[PDB]
């Protein structure tokens, strides 16, 4: 009796992710091929920013990933998999529980196989500080990829085997000593909404990924949260407004900069409610419009939208479905496991059934 699941395999370099330091049962995240990244940043960015910042920040990352062993920067096979414990410790200078956050960074800069590991984290988090400024948002680039069940090791590449759909506790590990796993997450991201709203009632709950941005002039942050909630996917937008509304207050006033508003206020009131009242106002028919001898007698109206804080520049959050816990009461634990010689604040989610979903901006 095994429930239906779906395994994946992909030949993935171990540049940003490590299925050796992170044991069986952590999250993963697929990426786009990074040749798309700063061409979109040249195109989609709001007026008056440094579009080449993404091409230079992502440039300095790859260039620091080798520095030695004579290794080319472009490649046919390319690492597009960022492990979850790598991503939390990247943005680890933007949480509240900082003493547990450096306890995530303590095994990140140590347990990884590599030379001068932490030189990436001062760069890769700056790459995320360039994703927001160059305005190609990482939830337009990141994408869920399943949780680990096994790994086959070679120098700088490995065979990542994950679960893209199904229950986590169903797929075989590889060692018949411990033939399953559990979803293992650091406690600097797992923030409930049960006690924080007062919902102490038992029931089945959903798991979401949630990003946070902060758009300012070179003061830009990033967070990743894995939130357990008994809420609908349609009914998250008010609850995320309650938490992160302070970041929404900052983004709507300090996110719009270097745009030039029209000076002074030029656009008057819109008089169509008054122009339709008089039957003595001049009009036009369907053939007389698009004619120069008729359009000059109509009302001239020149709308000037410049410097408006658009919806795309007032984003504070973006979420996606990740999975549910169908149990009667969701059974979470809070332990500290030993990743070598570093002990970590660890949240052990148990009985997770995977359903990915689309993203959704909370603009």
């Amino acid at each position: 009796g095994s429930p239906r699941h779906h395994l994946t395999r992909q030949v993935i370099l171990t540049d940003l992710c490590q299925p050796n330091a992170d044991r069986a049962g952590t999250l993963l995240l697929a990426l786009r091929h990074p040749a798309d990244l700063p061409h979109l940043a040249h195109q989609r960015a709001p007026p008056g920013r440094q579009t080449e910042r993404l091409g230079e920040a992502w440039g300095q990352l790859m260039e620091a990933t080798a520095l030695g062993s004579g290794r080319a920067e472009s490649g046919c096979t390319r690492a597009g998999l960022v492990s979850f414990n790598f991503l939390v410790a990247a943005c680890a200078a933007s949480y509240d529980a900082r003493d547990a956050a450096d306890a995530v960074r303590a095994h990140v800069t140590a347990n990884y196989r590599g030379t001068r590991v932490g030189a990436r984290l001062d760069r890769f988090s700056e790459c995320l500080r360039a994703m927001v400024h160059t305005h190609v948002f990482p939830h337009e680039v990141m994408r869920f990829f399943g949780g680990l069940v096994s790994w086959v090791t070679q120098d700088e590449l490995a065979s990542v085997t994950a679960v893209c759909a199904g229950p986590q506790e169903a797929a075989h590990t590889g060692h018949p000593g411990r033939p399953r796993s559990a979803v293992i997450l650091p406690a600097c991201a797992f923030v409930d909404l049960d006690a924080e709203l007062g919902l102490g009632g038992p029931g089945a709950a959903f798991l979401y990924l949630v990003f946070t941005y902060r758009q300012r002039r070179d003061q830009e942050l990033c967070c990743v949260y894995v939130i357990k909630s008994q809420l609908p996917p349609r009914g998250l937008e008010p609850a995320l407004e309650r938490l992160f509304g302070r970041l929404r207050i900052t983004n709507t006033i300090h996110g719009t900069e270097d745009m030039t508003p029209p000076a002074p206020n030029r656009n008057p009131d819109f008089p169509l409610a008054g122009l339709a009242a008089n039957p003595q106002t001049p009009r036009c028919s369907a053939g007389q419009v698009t004619n120069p001898q008729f359009a000059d007698r109509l009302y001239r109206w020149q709308p000037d939208l410049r410097g408006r804080p658009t919806a795309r520049t007032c984003t504070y959050a973006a979420f996606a479905e990740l999975g549910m816990m169908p149990e009667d009461s969701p059974r979470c634990l809070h332990r500290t496991e030993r990743f070598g010689a570093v002990s970590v604040p660890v949240v052990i989610l148990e009985g997770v059934v995977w359903r990915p979903g689309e993203w959704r901006a909370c603009a």
Partner: protein, 308 residues
Amino acid sequence: MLADGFETDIAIPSGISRPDAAALQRCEGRVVFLPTIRRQLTLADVAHESFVSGGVSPDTLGLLLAYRRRFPAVITRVLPTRIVACPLDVGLTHAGTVNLRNTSPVDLCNGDPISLVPPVFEGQATDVRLDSLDLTLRFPVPLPSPLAREIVARLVARGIRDLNDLNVLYYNGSRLSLLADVQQLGPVNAELRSLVLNMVYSITEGTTIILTLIPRLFALSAQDGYVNALLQMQSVTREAAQLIHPEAPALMQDGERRLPLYEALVAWLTHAGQLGDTLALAPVVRVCTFDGAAVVRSGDMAPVIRYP
């Protein structure tokens, strides 16, 4: 989704008379709102007495607003001691087929999405009452999807008139109206804000170019009849074009590298096109018959397979 299905068990109490027990066996396929996904609940949780706020039984409009915080489920079978339902948001059955029953005044067609609506119709608000337990079970009305975009749009537009006819509909030629009632000022302002957020967010600087295409359309409806019967006899843009001659702005700040028409359309899809999900709930369900007909009749069951 689980392999062996997932069926909650709404409990029936002890003391129920025979005029009430045969009143629940006509509830074979209806829409029942669980507040959580507990496997064990009570009828005192399901019924309208649990729906009330603090003592204010809300209108039809708030009854829209407290469905999107609940989990709609469909009864599959009724035992004497418990009622079994399946939540739509989790997983249907092994099959992915759960039989409904039309409460609608309007028959269905194949493939059409179902968004459910409160009992707004006149001579139609038929609540199955339990007398020996003192409960009212309001059963909502499954409707086809382009109806649910009308009726929600009729009610929100009506409440704006009170802040200073409309209630006539037509679908498949059968004339039907809706109940006129006073609307409380509370939940209507929760709709107006959910409009004007999604309404202003669809205005990017690129829309100053589209608003200078209005003189082209008002001349295009002169020649192609597709654009005549597009605008409407009762539209705004026709009388807007007869008085306004717009013209484009001169330049754009760094407008060479960016596409102004493209950003106005991406923001229009996720905000103003998405609007039919913010006011009402989400069209979870469409009708996928296996052998029966193109049309599913009123008072008849329908097999159902899920949907985005």
